[PDB]
């Protein structure tokens, strides 16, 4: 009969960062979905072609970038953000263009580390909000199998109230819960646990979608069924469904945030046989959603999750959305006020339910 709400629940007016609560007004210019450190080794796509073996063991170098872009998971070096010093330098680029906060949804199974997040936040001066929960079935630890939906919910609640991974750092978002195109029983159990935790903690809920598929409405049905708040639920990886305006708009209508977290990402995922859309295509979709009154549901990010996405390795880094995509949205007809809404007001809205709509 005790309340389990986070001291930084959506009706508190505060946000839980790895360094403690901050007023929602201090969030400022924000990147809603970025990985600062992680481990994607489980997604390694072994080259079966004899001609393509050199791509697996070699460290990222300028001469192999083209091939990596057509199959980023083929390279072992690429699939792990484990360079803290580089992470710090790359994040400083964001801070250099006004960046103030970063939401890191790296959860259980893919390298979440509060100790490392605090080091980055302290050295960069950029505020960091940490996520929680379980990812895709393949990344789930041996122990998850014995856990019930409520057991998973309990773990999340504890991280929002007590601490995480043996530290007193607490989460500020229940996030990047894995839902694959197969939407396995494990994943459903995981999502139900996250949704129940959303109700118990009052924290925003972020769900990883299989972007090239269309399970978003089924995802929201489940969240809604568990009693969670759709207006504080974020649907990740919307970029690939840019050509389905009805799909995207009806989702926004239900209240969920539509996160276009793949800005700048243009890879072809050989494994899945899917292509990331262009920024122009995404820009038009965003323009369409805004024209239909859903501007306050749109979120932008890069979803940096591999080394080749850092500028040091030829990538766009964490300052690309701010430096290059915003000007592109301008070219598509969006005004300054809209840009402020996208990078500042909407992120705040995800965490603060008292913020008026658009």
């Amino acid at each position: 009969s005790l309340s389990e709400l986070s001291p930084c629940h959506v009706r508190s007016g505060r946000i839980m960062t790895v360094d403690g609560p901050i007023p929602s007004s201090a969030l400022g210019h924000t990147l809603m979905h970025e990985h600062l450190q992680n481990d994607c080794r489980c997604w390694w796509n072994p080259p079966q072609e004899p001609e393509r073996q050199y791509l697996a063991e070699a460290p990222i170098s300028i001469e192999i970038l083209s091939e990596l872009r057509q199959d980023p998971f083929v390279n072992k070096h690429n699939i792990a953000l484990d360079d803290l010093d580089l992470a710090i330098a790359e994040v400083k680029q964001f801070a250099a263009v006004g960046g103030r906060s970063i939401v890191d949804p790296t959860c259980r199974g893919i390298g979440r580390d509060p100790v490392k997040l605090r080091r980055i936040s302290a050295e960069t001066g950029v505020q960091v909000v940490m996520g929680a929960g379980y990812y895709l079935a393949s990344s789930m630890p041996e122990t998850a199998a014995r856990l019930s939906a409520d057991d998973i919910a309990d773990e999340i609640v504890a991280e929002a109230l007590e601490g995480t991974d043996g530290t007193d750092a607490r989460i500020g978002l229940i996030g990047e819960i894995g839902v694959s195109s197969d939407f396995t029983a494990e994943e459903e159990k995981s999502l139900r646990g996250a949704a129940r935790a959303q109700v118990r903690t009052g924290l925003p809920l972020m769900v990883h979608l299989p972007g090239w598929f269309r399970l978003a409405h089924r995802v929201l049905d489940l969240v809604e069924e568990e009693g969670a708040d759709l207006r504080h639920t974020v649907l990740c990886h919307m970029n690939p469904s840019h050509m389905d305006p009805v799909y995207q708009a009806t989702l926004a209508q239900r209240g969920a945030f539509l996160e276009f977290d793949m800005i700048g990402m243009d890879f072809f995922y050989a494994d899945q046989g899917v292509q990331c859309p262009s920024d122009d295509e995404v820009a038009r979709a965003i323009l369409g959603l805004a024209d239909h009154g859903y501007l306050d549901r749109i979120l932008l990010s890069h979803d940096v999750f591999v080394k080749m996405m850092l500028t040091r390795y030829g990538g766009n880094g964490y300052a690309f959305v701010t430096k290059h995509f915003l000007p592109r949205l301008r070219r598509h007809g969006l005004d300054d006020a809209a840009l402020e809404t996208l990078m500042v007001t909407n992120p705040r809205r995800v965490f603060d339910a008292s913020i008026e709509g658009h």
Copy 2:
């Protein structure tokens, strides 16, 4: 006329390479539009902000590739393909995947050099066809002002029959004739001279178009009134108008080749404020044209023209179309017969009028 026809005119069944004539059947798997060596200094886009000054004088390195992709012309090192050894290595990648010939439309003003082409063909074993004529106005030498359209046609005729740039290497195509969005009086004179040379030499004609505009029909009107053969006229840079199927299909109907020579190029040209389309968007356009029966008018290439487009500098190289785009077209529905038509039959059709449609 007759005496001025190239030994390899479009009704000869032969093709003129920098190393001499070859039967059209020997052309094989081809890239219709690539620059092996060139000079694009005249297009350098000086960095306005003193904060981007480093992007101008610094050499290309993996750490600045993102910025360069948003403004390729800001970097001086990037705007000139001048390393022959690298050109040779990059071209071998194409040969390694079945590549047999490359058409280099580098013409006057942008660094055409028959000696270097011959070295590349010698060391790679890849057949090279050399272009000719004048490019965009800003690249034209001061001596071009004195030339009449006929004088320009005469120069082209001489390179088709006797030699080029002080060598005995003869051209096998007229082109990458520059037409800017402004279509200046000089560019018009240049194009008329090219069209007249097309009639006189009987060689294919290739025209550079400002891809983000829609001047193609005006271009064909002029080529046609000058008496040139539209069925052996190639319209370059069609990638940007992928969203205008009527425009593209009507051009194909008139008989011209639609060259999607920007496969793999995804830069944002800041100077002009235009964006290169994605390969998926281009693939859909190609499928559409084929659905309407215009498959025999489609050509593919990369238009490699700056350093960052080579694999050595993080780019796609000359083997990308073959290795990665053909599979993409396969994913879109084109069968193997169609891929053979695109990389072998069509290129042959450009140079040989006897190939059935």
Copy 3:
């Protein structure tokens, strides 16, 4: 204090017809929006060109139908359904093809008459449901100016519980509430009173939209803030917005019924300068709405409201949707189950909240 619910509220399982309550299961094959008798003289479009003067005064004859189709409101004889015997014969055609019920939304200002409706239901054997409330501004009674939103709600509640126009006939639907492209303060007051009546009586709410505009979301916003049930709110005249799938789908997602009540109407309204879409264009829009999972929100009717729409005058009559449009929907891809859903299940859903969705 004390309940004001109609004996046939949406959770009653019954429906109020001019002849009393009937189980919702008895509604059957239904036309959700038809006028059996009405008066549209206040919408006459006088021909400025003296050459077209003859069309204004002349009676409807086969010789001038072409001209009338290009400007229906030019003819005085056309803008009033006043022949009860013809109405009865025309309605018998609907019954002749399986029709069981008709919903007549003719309200105050446009000729609502419970006496006539009863004679029609009596002689045709077709069940008739009567609407209520006020229509567009220009048709509103002088007295409506003094009425407050609550007074309007009170009038509607009285017709749902006691009787209407001096009779004991009670209403079964609240509506064909007028909302013009101008959405005047009076129309807003009218709609607010209607929505309050929806909450108090529990009866369905039907709203007239200026189809060629996009005010539907603003309409639902108002019905929503007044506490009314969007799930039993019908948005009329959706046909003209067939080319705006995002707009239509997002309205359906909010829960409102999308009424394509202009089936068969292909006139050009000279006055407004608007053109009625073709049945093929509408069929495609309907297919799309269904493809997106909104089939249970789709309603179909003719909105017969002028003499020229009756078969006697060369028009389609009341049996057109059933005899000709359903087959067209089949040619487009809909099966008999879907057709059954459109003409029976959905109409029942309008009046009965116990009907399962999907």
Copy 4:
């Protein structure tokens, strides 16, 4: 030696009342039937509940049903009321109409005697067509006829007379091509095409509007050596949603005739629906936007009694009185309306008229 005295390069047009300079054609309807017989398309109702729609004369109370199955009514499928035809045509002259091209040919009731009565009484100039229509309407005698025999007949009607009169044809046309494109219809079309070469008159071809046989039709016509720039493709209305199909046909040089303006019936016998005027207007705008305004023709194809104002139809003045205003609402200016109703019809019959909007 077989050119009509009013061939397309003569500057003249052959009407049923003799030659007239092309400049005299004026405001014209390119495809209308003044008198005809469509009894062969009788679509009798096999259900008792629709038996009344068969032998009953058209009346106001059955119009809805007829619009859903035009051929179900006997009275409706024959324009045999000359007095009514005159009255209806006068409506067209009343709004500026000067000429009407009647493509009614062999098999569907062509009658020079009746056309002359109509022209004399209304003051409207009439151009008469020729050739054979759809397979199901060809006479038994056409079976033995070879393509050349068919062309011979057309030539005689162009130079000597028609059906025993001295009235001569001014257009070869409304040649029948069904969705099946039968052997007999192909022979008919080849004969028409050869006659186009011999007489130099324009060629008009009936197309199964809901299909896509136009390019195949133009292929045949072209190989028979006929003039594509004076070939008219009828019934383009139904392919309005295929801008590439329509634009490419226009690029080949043929006229695109939207002769079903105002026609909104559902042909139960074919299971096809006539498009709305708004949809057609959009298609016309698109073609003009891509520079094909000079290839666009408009008409009603009045061919059954219910299409006459007396029977609730639109009559022969609808295009002029109601569709032009619709085109204006869509964005076309007055000069474009002049181009559509006067200049283009003249272009059909006169090759000396230069192109453009």
